[PDB]
Amino acid sequence: SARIGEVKRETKQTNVSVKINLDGHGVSDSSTGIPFLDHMLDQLASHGLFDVHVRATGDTHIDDHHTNEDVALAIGTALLKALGERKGINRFGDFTAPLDEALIHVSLDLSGRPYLGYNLEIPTQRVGTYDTQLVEHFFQSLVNTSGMTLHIRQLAGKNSHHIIEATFKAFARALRQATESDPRRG
Amino acid sequence: SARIGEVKRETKQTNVSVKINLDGHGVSDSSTGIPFLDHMLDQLASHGLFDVHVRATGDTHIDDHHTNEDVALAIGTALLKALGERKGINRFGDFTAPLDEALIHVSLDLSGRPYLGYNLEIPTQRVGTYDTQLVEHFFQSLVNTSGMTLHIRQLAGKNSHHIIEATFKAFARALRQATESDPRRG
Amino acid sequence: SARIGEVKRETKQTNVSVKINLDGHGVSDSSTGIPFLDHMLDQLASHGLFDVHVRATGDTHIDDHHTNEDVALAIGTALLKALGERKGINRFGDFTAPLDEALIHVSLDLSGRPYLGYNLEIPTQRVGTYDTQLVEHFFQSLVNTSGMTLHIRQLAGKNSHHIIEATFKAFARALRQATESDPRRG
Amino acid sequence: SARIGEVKRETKQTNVSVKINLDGHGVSDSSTGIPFLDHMLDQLASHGLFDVHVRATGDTHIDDHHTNEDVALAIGTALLKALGERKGINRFGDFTAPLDEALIHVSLDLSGRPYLGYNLEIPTQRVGTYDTQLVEHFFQSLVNTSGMTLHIRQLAGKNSHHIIEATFKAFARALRQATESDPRRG
Amino acid sequence: SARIGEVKRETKQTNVSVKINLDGHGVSDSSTGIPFLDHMLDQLASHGLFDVHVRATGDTHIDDHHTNEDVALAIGTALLKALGERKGINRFGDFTAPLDEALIHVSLDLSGRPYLGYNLEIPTQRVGTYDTQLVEHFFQSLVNTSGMTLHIRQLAGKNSHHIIEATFKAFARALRQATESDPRRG
Amino acid sequence: SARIGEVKRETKQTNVSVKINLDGHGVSDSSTGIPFLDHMLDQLASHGLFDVHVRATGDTHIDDHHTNEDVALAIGTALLKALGERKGINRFGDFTAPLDEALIHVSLDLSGRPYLGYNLEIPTQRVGTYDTQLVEHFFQSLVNTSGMTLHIRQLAGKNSHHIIEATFKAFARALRQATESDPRRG
Ligand SMILES: O=P(O)(O)OC[C@H](O)[C@@H](O)c1cnc[nH]1
Ligand SMILES: O=P(O)(O)OC[C@H](O)[C@@H](O)c1cnc[nH]1
Ligand SMILES: O=P(O)(O)OC[C@H](O)[C@@H](O)c1cnc[nH]1
Ligand SMILES: O=P(O)(O)OC[C@H](O)[C@@H](O)c1cnc[nH]1
Ligand SMILES: O=P(O)(O)OC[C@H](O)[C@@H](O)c1cnc[nH]1
Ligand SMILES: O=P(O)(O)OC[C@H](O)[C@@H](O)c1cnc[nH]1
Ligand SMILES: [Mn+2]
Ligand SMILES: [Mn+2]
Ligand SMILES: [Mn+2]
Ligand SMILES: [Mn+2]
Ligand SMILES: [Mn+2]
Ligand SMILES: [Mn+2]
């Protein structure tokens, strides 16, 4: 049956619930209190064919940082849980996706060793109300709990929304590849 | 008994109440009308083991500047009052604390001569709704009324929230050291 | 009697009322819909000893630009009206004022020829909700309708609020000097 | 009556007595054990029309530093005391004075917030037996206890005695302006 | 009683056993098949007062890399286990230690978030038979499984053995501080 | 009982007597014929809680060099003697202390191998009558006879007296730490 991982975590700052199906149909059901992040999690579901269910609340009066971080941490853990024994999967993923003028290359390995390589240069400080420093932190936190090797390379781009969104498209497609069955490893 | 300092000050712009216990247990009770500052004052309490009670209101319609300044001024005065005759204390504090990639070295002396040395380079203009120029002004104002020699050195950091928060962790730990009894000066 | 100038102007975008007494006592009564500008107009009154009455409404949904501009234009006209025949006045003003680390030199002549020389470098984009580009535009518009020669020189400064506020202090003091009676020109 | 401030302070290192009349006639009566400093305090009295009475002794065997510092601290306190409630005064001062080729601009505000901006470049290490590093320290210490905002800008100069002396002339004249009654604030 | 963590892990490449006592007496009992690493683990025990028991074998015919990595991973896990609920500890550590001309500053937080900041510049490729690239990898792997925030700053140094050994001295002393009881958090 | 070291040495150039108590109460009793050095030795006693008794005479007609050197040599020997078998001590010390704008980091190890790392940049040639080249020589000579590893790093500073004095404060505090009992090495 489908590989599903679920995490619930409450702290004094945030409360987060995540459920991810690696064998999904792109069902997008994310509400973090951070609308731009919800849009990116929808991208993860649609471009990766994951089913993504996220609920979070938190101390957004301070800033979006703790919520963003705790959502990412929980997603990484949910991915780890869903992966189970990791038998028979491709393990590696590699994809370069555009959004108009933006072009982002993502390469990853479900290695069990956390590492983020990241060189995005996002030229504005806010996309809507979303602090663009939080993009790197989202991926770093996700890597840290999932135990993923992840490289994100900005090949082109000028519009901040395009850069970030193309990153999520490429990541989702690379992660779909990595999590799928390898037909010669059954 | 415990060294407690209290200040109340009302101006045409702000109204501030501060009570600080140098011999506290980290009781955090700060409401300034500036949520990010409240978070940093919680850090001061938790990392310093001060009991910190702050209430402020002010002209935040203009910007957070007058409130931030008047809170800092009052805290410096409250620290001065709490210190009393300053007998038997370590006087000096020195600590370097991280928050992830950020690393901040704080050195201080409860000297009676105000000085701020500060080289933070905070790469974004807003953390939540908090103007990052206000960090330096908070420490400068606090130094001016407390009569503290304070040096803040940014050794590493990229995320603005991490840089500022690590600064408060390091400051709190250095100030705890300085305010504690020196076992050989009794 | 006192030199008073009054202007009312309604356009499709803004509605502005200004009354200025050159021989005032620093009565501050400004409500523009732009809180930071209200604070600066209070500075004008208090540091210049002008009585300043301003009411404005406008299309702040778009941005503060049209309101800021129309307020400034009306103030310049009100100053011109109040000056009347300009007999017996000092005409020239010259003052350098600080606000903490900021230091601003203003020199002006009530010449009848508009000119703004301005070299402020305001290092952040927003003070509260006030767009810092609007400072230069305020002075330019005021100069244009008053027919003033005005030079503003930033000698020092780092905090944007301090830079802008010191500018208004220096301007107010220079304008007080220029508008006052010359004891040898009666 | 005249605004007079008096300070006496004895430490293990120095003994200092200061009496300053803000409403003086330039009576110069300074003996610090540092002859060049006595000359500068005479300049303060003569160019500011303060009456300045200073007596100091100290550990000049070590160097002039502690004496210079403690004299400056006491002067700042005496100024603060003499100012009293600060009602009706100009508050701000601004003057540029030469001594031959030297030209020094001083701007100050009796603000209650200490700040020194200082860019003198004194090209020799000793004027007589006076260590030229002590000039900055004199002004810094004075600012710290008086709660003054003070900016000192070297516009020209080559001879060290001229640079330092012009600074005291300009400071004295700016401080006279700041401390005098504002005829419209009675 | 004493906080002890134990890890055993066998892979196709290496076999590692670690037992660490956080409340030790500096008992040094390390045999990794990598003599220079054994020397550094002795330093960890002696300078940290940890009891350190390590046994490892592995594919040193290929190079020391897999053994070094797997030892480090296991040590990080053993530290995590030994820490237990982490109640009442200092949590943060900060120390700068020399070895002759080498001087290394280590700052760490037992945060639960892995991060390594590292700027060593080791000027030779081999210390004995030990590949000096393996130093960074040892700390990175240890951080990854322990969930430690760790910064290592080379302040001075020329001799590779001195640089690496001073790093272990400083790390051990910082980790001792972090793991010890905070007398005010009981 | 208290760890006391005493040295007497007469040469054709100087005559020096030193007695140091590592377990002192900050008793300061130094007379070298070099007043600035006496002030620094008082700092050593007060900031380190050493009891420091020094008497020296010498050929100060030539310059202060031989006296300064011979005092330092004797102090290093006295420290070595007082340390005795060096059992149970912390051995390492690490502290960063300010004096106003100056900030100096000292790290040391009572290693038995002499080394001085020193990067002070003292911007004037004389503090009082004390030749500022003699600061480095004092520490070098002390290191050479004590067998100490000592690093002195200037992090900030402009006033020569402040730079040198902060160095002695930091050194004294680091040396107090190194010489004190380690509670876990009894
Ligand atoms: O690539 P998708 O099919 O998910 O479509 C993306 C949308 O165009 C949208 O999110 C967008 C287009 N430009 C910025 N954002
Ligand atoms: O160090 P603390 O125990 O006070 O925890 C701090 C929190 O992690 C939090 O304030 C934070 C983490 N990243 C940004 N902020
Ligand atoms: O100079 P004033 O007496 O008008 O006082 C100004 C206030 O201190 C205030 O507007 C301010 C201080 N720092 C930023 N703003
Ligand atoms: O300007 P004053 O009237 O006080 O006269 C100053 C003197 O000329 C004197 O102090 C001087 C001239 N050159 C260096 N010093
Ligand atoms: O600092 P320790 O007491 O552990 O002694 C270290 C030894 O001197 C030694 O490991 C060494 C000295 N130079 C390189 N290595
Ligand atoms: O830090 P201490 O308590 O020893 O006080 C030092 C004195 O202020 C003094 O030595 C000094 C202050 N500025 C230069 N020297
Ligand atoms: Mn974070
Ligand atoms: Mn989109
Ligand atoms: Mn301010
Ligand atoms: Mn935080
Ligand atoms: Mn316009
Ligand atoms: Mn203001």
Ligand SMILES: [Mn+2]
């Ligand atoms: Mn000083």
Ligand SMILES: [Mn+2]
């Ligand atoms: Mn002269």
Ligand SMILES: [Mn+2]
């Ligand atoms: Mn590897």
Ligand SMILES: [Mn+2]
């Ligand atoms: Mn060795």
Ligand SMILES: [Mn+2]
């Ligand atoms: Mn010599």
Ligand SMILES: [Mn+2]
């Ligand atoms: Mn001194």
